[PDB]
């Protein structure tokens, strides 16, 4: 499946599309969101077991799970929400995150590999989608 390896940012332009698809209404790129530092990440996996720490400079969270299982979490406001990682082909995995009910859109993310150093990881959320290619540091 690949994935095991740190990942540098490569091609990223969806942040505004996130605050623009959730329902633009004075948000307009939230006049603040864009890119001030370098949002890096580091994956650590052993077979079907995977770990994912997406940080940038300050503290952050990471999912030390193993594909075939779900995690837990909470949305911004409304109801709670868990997640669940799976596969697609063998080097492309997903992570459908739901709020145990869903009202309209939903959250989720799919990490995919390419050639041998092009990890494109997407991550939707409330109809938004953060898609950016990565490479192995």
From Swiss-Prot:
Induction summary: By retinoic acid.
Compartments where found: Cytoplasm; Endoplasmic reticulum; Nucleus
Q: Which Pfam families match?
A: Lipocalin (PF00061)
Keyword Endoplasmic reticulum assigned: yes
Which positions are tagged coiled coil? none
Q: Which CDD domains does its entry note?
A: CRABP2
UniProt modification remark:
Sumoylated in response to retinoic acid binding, sumoylation is critical for dissociation from ER and subsequent nuclear translocation.
- Result, substituting residue 30 to A: Loss of ligand-induced nuclear import
Fetch the SUPFAM superfamilies from UniProt.
Lipocalins
Highest taxon of source: Eukaryota
Positions bound to all-trans-retinoate: 132-134
Q: Where is this cross-link: Glycyl lysine isopeptide (Lys-Gly) (interchain with G-Cter in SUMO)?
A: 101
* Entries under InterPro entries matching the protein: Calycin (IPR012674), Fatty_acid-bd (IPR000463), ILBP (IPR031259), Lipocln_cytosolic_FA-bd_dom (IPR000566)
Motif, Nuclear localization signal: chain positions = 20-30
Entry remark concerning the domains of this protein: Forms a beta-barrel structure that accommodates hydrophobic ligands in its interior.
The record's subunit annotation is: Interacts with RXR and RARA. Interacts with importin alpha.
Q: What is this protein called?
A: Cellular retinoic acid-binding protein 2
Give the organism the record lists. Answer: Homo sapiens
